[PDB]
């Protein structure tokens, strides 16, 4: 099972590489990895299991974070729970949004304050565990989580988006989500 020890941290070059497209039909190994990734997210959000396994609560995970450079992401948002293979953002809203509390990441062992501005609405296409295609419209927190994970497969970390000069600057028109 996936543990914190399996999650690589900032400094490991794999986090900055562009993940490889995975085969379709989905291989049994990529299917198994996805299952284990979703299990990890669920375990991290169960108060008892999180304590037993000493896990940080997490709503999204990307294969690169396990040192597996593949375009596979898992999300479990407290409304959306699935594994996406070869996910792509087909379109997005003009309107942007950011989490009021900023963002974190299990691969980052320091607090990096500041707003991470992302698109409030996105249309994403992906293949599920069976290799069947899906086209979904996401918004708000779900959209934020998916963009955070897709960034991982493109070698991007959340703090790359923070305006170091003015970490809490809020443009015109940007929404704020307060969890």
Q: Which residues are annotated as a binding site for Fe cation?
A: 105, 148, 152
Residue 75 makes contact with Ni ion by CB under 5 A: no
- Closest distance of CB 33 from Ni ion, Å: 17
- Closest distance of CB 107 from Ni ion, Å: 6
φ/ψ (deg, to 5) at 143: -65, -40
Number of shown-chain residues binding Ni ion (CB under 5 A): 1
As a residue count, the chain comes to: 179
Bridge-based pairing state of the strands 96-99 and 175-177: parallel
How many C-beta atoms surround the C-beta of residue 47 within 10 A?
8
**Nearer Cβ to Ni ion (27/108):** 108
**Nearer Cβ to Ni ion (99/105):** 105
**Nearer Cβ to Ni ion (75/105):** 105
| From 21, 149, 172, 178, active-site residue | 149
Query: How many helices (H) does the chain have, and how many strands (E)?
Result: 3, 8
SS3 4: helix
**CA–CA distance from 87 to each of 44, 83, 178 (Å)?**
23, 10, 26
Interactions with Ni ion, residue window 76-135 (CB under 5 A) = 105
Phi-psi region of 146 (alpha: psi -120 to 50; beta: other; left: phi over 0): alpha
Taking alpha carbons only, the member of 79, 1, 86, 87 closest to residue 38 is: 1
- Residue 101 falls in the annotated catalytic set: no
**Nearer Cβ to Ni ion (85/159):** 159
* Site residues, Ni ion (CB under 5 A): 105
Active site amino acids: 149
């Amino acid at each position: 099972m996936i543990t914190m020890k399996d999650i690589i941290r900032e400094g490991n070059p794999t986090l900055r590489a562009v993940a490889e497209e995975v085969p379709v039909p989905i291989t049994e190994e990529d299917r198994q990895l996805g299952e284990d990734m979703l299990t990890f997210l669920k375990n991290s959000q169960d108060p008892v299991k999180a304590e037993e396994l000493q896990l940080r609560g997490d709503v999204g995970l990307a294969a690169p974070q396990l040192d597996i450079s593949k375009r596979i992401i898992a999300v479990h948002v407290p409304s959306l729970s699935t594994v996406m293979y070869n996910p792509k953002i087909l379109s997005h809203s003009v309107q942007d949004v950011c989490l009021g509390e900023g963002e974190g990441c299990l691969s980052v062992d320091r607090d990096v304050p500041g707003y991470v501005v992302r698109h409030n609405k996105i249309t994403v296409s992906y293949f599920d565990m069976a290799g069947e295609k899906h086209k979904v419209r996401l918004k708000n927190y779900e959209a934020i989580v998916v963009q955070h994970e897709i960034d991982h497969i493109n070698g991007i970390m959340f703090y790359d988006h923070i305006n170091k000069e003015n970490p809490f600057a809020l443009k015109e028109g940007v929404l704020v989500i307060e969890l």
